[PDB]
Paper text:
Like ArgBP, CDT adopts a periplasmic type-II SBP fold, but instead of binding amino acids, it catalyzes the Grob-like fragmentation of prephenate and L-arogenate to form phenylpyruvate and L-phenylalanine, respectively. We previously used ancestral sequence reconstruction to show that the trimeric CDT from Pseudomonas aeruginosa (PaCDT) plausibly evolved from a monomeric cationic amino acid-binding protein ancestor (AncCDT-1) via a series of intermediates (AncCDT-2 to AncCDT-5)40. In this work, we have studied the structural dynamics of a series of states along an evolutionary trajectory from an ancestral L-arginine solute-binding protein (AncCDT-1) to an extant dehydratase (PaCDT).
In this work, we have additionally assessed the dehydratase activity of AncCDT-5, which proved to be an intermediate between the AncCDT-3 variants and the extant enzyme PaCDT. Beginning from this closed state, we again performed triplicate 500 ns MD simulations after removing the HEPES molecule. The simulations predict that the protein rapidly adopts a wide-open conformation, with a Q68-R138 Cα–Cα distance range of 3.6–4.2 nm (Gd(III)–Gd(III) distance range: 4.5–5.4 nm) that is analogous to the wide-open conformation seen in the MD simulations of AncCDT-1, the crystal structure of the L-arginine-binding protein from T. maritima, and the crystal structure of AncCDT-3. The combination of the DEER, crystallographic and MD data for the experiments performed on AncCDT-3 and AncCDT-5 suggest that both proteins predominantly access a wide-open state in solution.
Numbering used by the authors: 12 to 245
Write the structure that this text describes.
Amino acid sequence: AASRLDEIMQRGTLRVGTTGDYKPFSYRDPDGQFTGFDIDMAESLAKSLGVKVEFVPTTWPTLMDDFQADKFDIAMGGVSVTPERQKKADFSEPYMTDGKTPIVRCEDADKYQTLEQIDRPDVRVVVNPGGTNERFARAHLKQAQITVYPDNVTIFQEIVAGRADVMMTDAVETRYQQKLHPGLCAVHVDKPFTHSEKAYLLPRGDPAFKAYVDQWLHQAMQSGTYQRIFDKWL
Ligand SMILES: [Cl-]
């Protein structure tokens, strides 16, 4: 019945679900430390509340089930607002805009500027399984050969090696991957095919907790805190 704010204050810690697999938002290094834009934002929210932060590992396939099992109070780590997630959770106000856009071999940058160019019988589109990327590919590709590749790290090497031609993912991810792989280039990264918003996942039916988060976030956007963290990571 009581707000999660009460439980957080009594416990003395804010439990933050995060995947640790999405630079620059959230990454868990071998030593077990989390770093990234949303790790720093989580520390700022916890500081506002006067509590310690505890990072709770989750994964994209288990995010919602873990949240419903009360494994954490809020999820922070490059999470897009989606209608599917809104059935089971609320969201904070958004903290940045994103969208899906291609990443290709640099020599192919001009070949794959539009979906009409990509959606052709001989184009080999690769995608990671089970999430918003595969949903996007299957909703927008009627002719291209879609291959699902299971390894979320080595998938980009499929394009480098010439086993695939295009992958469409979050524009922020294409920025990171085109720096990591010199042979790949993000396609019109400032004008993605879709418009999405990143936000923090919150429990339904707790307007007080959501209002606290929204107020902290609005203050951070105008105080210099957001600017500093954004400049460090994005
Ligand atoms: Cl995905």
